[PDB]
Design a binder for this molecule. Structure first.
Ligand SMILES: O=c1ccn([C@@H]2O[C@H](COP(=O)(O)OP(=O)(O)OP(=O)(O)OP(=O)(O)OP(=O)(O)OP(=O)(O)O)[C@@H](O)[C@H]2O)c(=O)[nH]1
Length: 124
């Protein structure tokens, strides 16, 4: 099956673009990363940094995860991100999203050997 770390890259990494310029970015990216295949994933964040930079967050600031697990980490630096949020008009299979660009600290959960991001928890 798909590994958790690979799923995290597919759902949350987009180092190919410095930031969402396009109003259409989320519509396209939610679809192409398979986040709209079986339903419209309601909220999803893409991070525009190198994979090394995001993996490094697993050795940065240890914080509580929203679900109460203790294995979340907050980036010391802000990073460029895009939040995709489903619209109220959106109806599967024609999922529609608002594309919001920001620079924020990311919070990810890390697991494994190697210790790598497996879940996007929040941005702050
Ligand atoms: O920034 C984000 C937040 C989430 N995600 C993805 O979504 C999945 C489900 O994670 P979830 O936290 O349960 O989703 P959401 O409650 O709607 O998050 P939220 O940003 O909407 O905000 P919250 O978690 O804090 O809940 P809330 O909507 O504020 O509730 P309330 O204030 O009215 O009481 C995660 O695994 C991530 O893959 C993301 O990519 N970027």
């Amino acid at each position: 099956k798909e590994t958790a770390a690979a799923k995290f890259e597919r759902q949350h990494m987009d180092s190919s673009t410095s930031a969402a310029s396009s109003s259409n970015y989320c519509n396209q990216m939610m679809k192409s990363r398979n986040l709209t295949k079986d339903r419209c994933k309601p909220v999803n964040t893409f991070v525009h940094e190198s994979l090394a930079d995001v993996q490094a967050v697993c050795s940065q600031k240890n914080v509580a995860c929203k679900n109460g697990q203790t294995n979340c980490y907050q980036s010391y630096s802000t990073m460029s991100i895009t939040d995709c949020r489903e619209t109220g008009s959106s109806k599967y299979p024609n999922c529609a999203y608002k594309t919001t660009q920001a620079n924020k600290h990311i919070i990810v959960a890390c697991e494994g050997n190697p210790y790598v991001p497996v879940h996007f928890d929040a941005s702050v």
